[PDB]
Amino acid sequence: SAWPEEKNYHQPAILNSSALRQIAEGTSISEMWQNDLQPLLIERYPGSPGSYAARQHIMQRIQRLQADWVLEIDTFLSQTPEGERSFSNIISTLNPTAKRHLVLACHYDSKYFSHWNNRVFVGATDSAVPCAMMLELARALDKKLLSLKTVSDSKPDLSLQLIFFDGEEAFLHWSPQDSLYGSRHLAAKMASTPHPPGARGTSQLHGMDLLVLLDLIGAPNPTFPNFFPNSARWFERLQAIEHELHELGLLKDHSLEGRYFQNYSYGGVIQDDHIPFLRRGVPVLHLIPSPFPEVWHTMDDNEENLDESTIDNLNKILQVFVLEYLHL
Ligand SMILES: Cn1cnnc1C1CCN(c2ncccc2-c2ccc(F)nc2)CC1
Numbered sequence: 001s002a003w004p005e006e007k008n009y010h011q012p013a014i015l016n017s018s019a020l021r022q023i024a025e026g027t028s029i030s031e032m033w034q035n036d037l038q039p040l041l042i043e044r045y046p047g048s049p050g051s052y053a054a055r056q057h058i059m060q061r062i063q064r065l066q067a068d069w070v071l072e073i074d075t076f077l078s079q080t081p082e083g084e085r086s087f088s089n090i091i092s093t094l095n096p097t098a099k100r101h102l103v104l105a106c107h108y109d110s111k112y113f114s115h116w117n118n119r120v121f122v123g124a125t126d127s128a129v130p131c132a133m134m135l136e137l138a139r140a141l142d143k144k145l146l147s148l149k150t151v152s153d154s155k156p157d158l159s160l161q162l163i164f165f166d167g168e169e170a171f172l173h174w175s176p177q178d179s180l181y182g183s184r185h186l187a188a189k190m191a192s193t194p195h196p197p198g199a200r201g202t203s204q205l206h207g208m209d210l211l212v213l214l215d216l217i218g219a220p221n222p223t224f225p226n227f228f229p230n231s232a233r234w235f236e237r238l239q240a241i242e243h244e245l246h247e248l249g250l251l252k253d254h255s256l257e258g259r260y261f262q263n264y265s266y267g268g269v270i271q272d273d274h275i276p277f278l279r280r281g282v283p284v285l286h287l288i289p290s291p292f293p294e295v296w297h298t299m300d301d302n303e304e305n306l307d308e309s310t311i312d313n314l315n316k317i318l319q320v321f322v323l324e325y326l327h328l
């Protein structure tokens with residue numbers, strides 16, 4: 001049918017002030033910090049013990065929730081500059097046979113570097129915080145997301161998916177063949193896979209309303225450009241949510257002159273896990289700052305250099321965004 005075009009006309013169900021206060025009060029940065037983030041602050045490049053531990057951690061944290069998440073592990077082999085390696089994308093889906101999903105994503109691998117001093121790269125912004133933000137969103141909205149389990153003809157056929165990509169980082173020199181291992185694999189698989197099952201023509205990529213990719217988040221004073229015109233209206237919703245939460249007194253250490261979501265765009269093309277989706281026509285909201293964090297790809301990309309209030313603030317904005325999108 002014309003269902004793959006529904007995303008083009010889809011509108012948010014905007015939350016009122018008292019709902020905004022409830023969402024702000026319902027997320028806990030200290031609980032995220034201890035229970036979702038700190039266990040991921042480990043070396044976790046492909047095939048390392050930390051890769052397996054990261055995956056177990058993400059999966060166990062989703063499995064304890066009441067909403068009916070369906071977990072799948074998309075495991076495959078690829079040649080790399082270091083020789084053949086195994087990669088595992090984690091896909092967590094509410095209502096897997098719904099035609100449409102809003103997709104939130106990040107990479108859970110860490111870049112490989114040799115141990116300078118007695119120090120290891122743990123990629124706190126890149127992307128342990130994004131992962132933790134997705135896990136906290138799933139926990140904080142769990143009661144609301146539990147209502148998607150209820151079938152109803154008064155609601156679009158739309159639900160939520162989380163993707164935690166493996167192998168985003170280059171092993172040696174970033175290039176088309178050394179980078180994006182997980183996302184290139186998963187976009188190709190999805191493009192090839194009928195959706196809904198038994199359909200003619202339409203693939204799982206037609207089902208992706210919008211790919212919201214979080215990356216390099218956790219530094220103070222981030223500035224996110226509005227990268228793409230086909231997601232500019234959704235970006236402007238993040239600006240509006242930020243502004244309203246500010247005005248209601250629900251953000252912390254936040255000024256309108258230091259706001260995160262900016263009017264301007266970006267002069268180049270940033271390569272990331274969204275590329276294999278974007279080149280096949282999926283709309284993307286790329287929540288990556290420009291400039292990148294000062295600590296990018298250094299041993300100082302660590303817990304000490306994260307900003308609690310910034311991440312808390314962004315948690316509130318993202319949670320509101322997702323509820324508005326899904327009409328919850
Ligand atoms: C998105 N992301 C996460 N961590 N690093 C990145 C970007 C990915 C794209 N990047 C590059 N793009 C084109 C050519 C080279 C790079 C690059 C990638 C990795 C690296 F370590 N150095 C340069 C910059 C870093």
Ligand SMILES: [Zn+2]
Binds near residue numbers: 126
């Ligand atoms: Zn990186």
